[PDB]
């Protein structure tokens, strides 16, 4: 509260560490469904159904231009990528399995880096 603060957690390396994680996600072999924005002209249903599209290129640009105020907003966009994927894709499809795999990969790096 006012004039009463928890000890200051060092957050000076967060930007660098989120970039590293994002690099690891970008280079994973199962990243291909997620590298670029879904083409809303070419994929029926996507525009109407997925209220907040997100992809790795868009996260990389936001990261690079100071549009994440803290590491929680970064994790929210990453998770949005996989939540969108589960909304639109069957679990037993290549893309559906890609998304589960990538979410697992991310969540481990996130825990190991920050928790």
From Swiss-Prot:
Instruction: State the tissue distribution.
Output: Expressed at varying levels in several tissues, whereas a smaller transcript was expressed specifically in testis.
Q: Where in the cell is it found?
A: Nucleus
Q: Domain named Bromo: which ranges?
A: 9-113
**First and last residue of the signal peptide:** none
Q: How the protein assembles, per its UniProt entry?
A: Component of the BRF-1 ISWI chromatin remodeling complex, at least composed of SMARCA1 and BAZ2B, which regulates the spacing of histone octamers on the DNA template to facilitate access to DNA. Within the BRF-1 ISWI chromatin remodeling complex interacts with SMARCA1; the interaction is direct. Component of the BRF-5 ISWI chromatin remodeling complex, at least composed of SMARCA5/SNF2H and BAZ2B, which regulates the spacing of histone octamers on the DNA template to facilitate access to DNA.
Family in the record: Belongs to the WAL family.
Q: What does this protein do?
A: Regulatory subunit of the ATP-dependent BRF-1 and BRF-5 ISWI chromatin remodeling complexes, which form ordered nucleosome arrays on chromatin and facilitate access to DNA during DNA-templated processes such as DNA replication, transcription, and repair. Both complexes regulate the spacing of nucleosomes along the chromatin and have the ability to slide mononucleosomes to the center of a DNA template. The BRF-1 ISWI chromatin remodeling complex has a lower ATP hydrolysis rate than the BRF-5 ISWI chromatin remodeling complex.
Q: State the protein's name.
A: Bromodomain adjacent to zinc finger domain protein 2B
Q: Which organism is it from?
A: Homo sapiens (Human)
